[PDB]
Amino acid sequence: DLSAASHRIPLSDGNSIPIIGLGTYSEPKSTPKGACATSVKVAIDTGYRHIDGAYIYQNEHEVGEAIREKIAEGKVRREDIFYCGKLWATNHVPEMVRPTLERTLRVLQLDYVDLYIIEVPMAFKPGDEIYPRDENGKWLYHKSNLCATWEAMEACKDAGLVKSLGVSNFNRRQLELILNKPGLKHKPVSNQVECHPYFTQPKLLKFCQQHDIVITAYSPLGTSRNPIWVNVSSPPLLKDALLNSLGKRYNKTAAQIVLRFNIQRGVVVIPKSFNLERIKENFQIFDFSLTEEEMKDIEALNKNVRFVELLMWRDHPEYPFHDEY
Numbered sequence: 014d015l016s017a018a019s020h021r022i023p024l025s026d027g028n029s030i031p032i033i034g035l036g037t038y039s040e041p042k043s044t045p046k047g048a049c050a051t052s053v054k055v056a057i058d059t060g061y062r063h064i065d066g067a068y069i070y071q072n073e074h075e076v077g078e079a080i081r082e083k084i085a086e087g088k089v090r091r092e093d094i095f096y097c098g099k100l101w102a103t104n105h106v107p108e109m110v111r112p113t114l115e116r117t118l119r120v121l122q123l124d125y126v127d128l129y130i131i132e133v134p135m136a137f138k139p140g141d142e143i144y145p146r147d148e149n150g151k152w153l154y155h156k157s158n159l160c161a162t163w164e165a166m167e168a169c170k171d172a173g174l175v176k177s178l179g180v181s182n183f184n185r186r187q188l189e190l191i192l193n194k195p196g197l198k199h200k201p202v203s204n205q206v207e208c209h210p211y212f213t214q215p216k217l218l219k220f221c222q223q224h225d226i227v228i229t230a231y232s233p234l235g236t237s238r239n240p241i242w243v244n245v246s247s248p249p250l251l252k253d254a255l256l257n258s259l260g261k262r263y264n265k266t267a268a269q270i271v272l273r274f275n276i277q278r279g280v281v282v283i284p285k286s287f288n289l290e291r292i293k294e295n296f297q298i299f300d301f302s303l304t305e306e307e308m309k310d311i312e313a314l315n316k317n318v319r320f321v322e323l324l325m326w327r328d329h330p331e332y333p334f335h336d337e338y
């Protein structure tokens with residue numbers, strides 16, 4: 014079915030999305046300049062046709078640099094590349110949405126993005142600081158109004174600035190809000206959330222499928238496990254006994270096993286790697302398939318524990334991780 018040359022799955026709005034993509038977040042201070050650009054280029058050469066990024070990653074300009082060069086050389090046409098950008102918490106004010114998208118378009122130097130999503134359901138105080146906090150370190154929040162923000166996102170698609178609209182880190186309630194919104198124009202086609210063998214998102218996935226919403230699994234390899242923000246209570250996902258055991262069976266790494274797992278269930282994966290060898294390794298997941306029994310055993314690894322909890326914002330009205338899903 015899915016192959017290296019053809020692995021795009023349909024979105025509810027008529028568009029399609031490559032089931033595998035390259036994630037581009039990397040610790041700014043511990044990441045060499047140009048690393049993201051080089052990686053995106055290698056990814057496209059390897060076969061990737063989906064790049065997931067965000068203005069707040071502070072490297073969106075490198076992403077554009079790489080994409081434009083590949084188009085310029087004729088490696089791919091703009092329509093062959095799928096780029097996803099995100100609207101940060103400090104840009105949820107309706108009037109700020111379009112200008113925020115336009116900024117990203119100017120940074121990437123492209124006419125449009127394939128997918129633009131609300132980064133988090135929580136709104137933070139607008140400004141030049143992506144992490145608002147007063148003198149006491151108290152997080153400066155802002156009253157959220159998802160419906161209004163969405164209408165602003167819908168306007169962007171009406172203007173032809175983005176092909177598809179979606180969300181990220183949205184729970185069932187927040188999704189319903191948009192889905193049941195009076196006079197809804199464009200339903201969200203995707204919800205990007207943490208998803209892997211240790212957090213399979215069983216209920217959220219079923220809900221999203223009822224509405225034809227595709228789930229993009231971020232941190233599909235269990236994250237970089239940076240203690241500064243990652244909950245390390247759970248052991249290294251890639252060190253899992255079963256995942257590695259199944260890997261020996263197909264002569265694949267645990268990383269490849271976990272990526273095959275999600276894409277085989279229709280979940281898009283956006284593994285991040287700025288390493289030449291690992292970028293290639295993560296794409297080699299079309300030359301084999303997991304048996305149903307194996308698929309069920311891997312799913313059974315679910316621990317219901319998030320690597321990305323974002324506890325520092327558990328008090329924000331829109332914190333999405335309080336509910337079961």
Ligand SMILES: NC(=O)c1ccc[n+]([C@@H]2O[C@H](COP(=O)([O-])OP(=O)(O)OC[C@H]3O[C@@H](n4cnc5c(N)ncnc54)[C@H](OP(=O)(O)O)[C@@H]3O)[C@@H](O)[C@H]2O)c1
Pocket residue numbers: 035036037038039065066132181182205230231232233234235236237238251266268269283284285286287288291292294295321
């Ligand atoms: N929307 C949201 O709220 C949200 C949140 C977090 C992340 N994301 C997106 O999701 C992407 C993926 O998640 P993530 O970066 O957190 O995590 P991840 O993709 O789960 O894991 C990345 C870590 O794994 C390493 N790695 C990559 N391939 C490997 C392989 N084959 N074997 C062993 N280690 C490997 C990477 O190091 P090397 O680079 O050295 O290979 C890096 O430290 C992000 O980069 C971003 O585009 C979205």
Ligand SMILES: C[C@]12C=CC(=O)C=C1CC[C@@H]1[C@@H]2C(=O)C[C@@]2(C)[C@H]1CC[C@]2(O)/C(O)=C/O
Pocket residue numbers: 038067099132144241242321323
């Ligand atoms: C999840 C998150 C927000 C949405 C997104 O697309 C990607 C990321 C990955 C990096 C996270 C970021 C945050 O939410 C803020 C964090 C957690 C940052 C790493 C350190 C950080 O910048 C911090 O500690 C300041 O608050």
